Design a protein around this nucleic acid. Structure first.
Lengths: 80, 80, 80, 80
DNA sequence: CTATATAGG
DNA sequence: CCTATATAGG
DNA sequence: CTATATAGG
DNA sequence: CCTATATAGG
């Protein structure tokens, strides 16, 4: 039962890592989005203050991305 | 923190979903590679036994692969 | 030295099949574009009144397209 | 109407560019398949001897493959 | 000698 | 996979 | 038995 | 290409 503690517009917030819809890195930052009851809830926390399960999500996200990319890059070279 | 239990090569294995590096769907089967303490490990359970957590990871990978698929399905119909 | 005789906005026009930049079919029609000295020159002539070299261009165009498509379609199914 | 002259399997061939079904570039080589009277024929000349007409066909195929490549190169950088 | 891009085999 | 083509690379 | 999606071999 | 997994298909 891990929760990512972050701030959004200065206010403290706590999302349930399992309610997080997607993750990605922007430098040192680990941004993400959650389902805050119907709408898109944004948030980002610096890597060093991020729960491990959030980093795992980010990791799998970057891996999932690289793959799609390596696959996209492929179709491009087939067009020279 | 959920230990998904499976049987690989006759060995009743059990890996914490946190170690999961990648999850993908093959029919009604959910396969995944995990961090087998340094090296890449593998395992598969039937969707039926997949803990909701693992299925969420899978749903995140898919949610993304479906967005790019949208753009491709785009640039596609934009035939001529 | 083939020229496609077509009408554009009621006016007669004659483009040099080799000055045609690209072709594609829209039903019975064979549309295309030419380099009318710097800018994009449009035109379309029904298939039955189209020079053979224009049909060959259309043919290769549809073949070139199908290929790119068959290649695009591929990358999509790799994302299920 | 230009007869591109080439040597295939020791046979000094010569096909009217009108019969060309597809042209593509392989290094400084221009390959192409033509309509060998019903069946698909093949041939290749060095860009150097390619009549401007054939090279135009090639330029049309490429012009298009470069547009799709643009959209893919698009949906690509649009990482996250 | 294989690589390169391709279609038919 | 192989072919057949022009040229490159080492 | 292969197909299916995949990563490491 | 092979493996190893759940299930499908015939």
């Amino acid at each position: 039962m891990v929760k990512v503690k972050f701030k959004y517009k200065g206010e403290e917030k706590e999302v349930d890592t399992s309610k997080i819809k997607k993750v990605w890195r922007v430098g040192k930052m680990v941004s993400f989005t959650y389902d805050d009851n119907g709408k898109t809830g944004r948030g980002a926390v610096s890597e060093k203050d991020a729960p491990k399960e959030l980093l795992d999500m980010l990791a799998r996200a970057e891996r999932e991305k690289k793959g799609v990319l390596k696959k996209l890059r492929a179709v491009e070279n087939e067009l020279h």
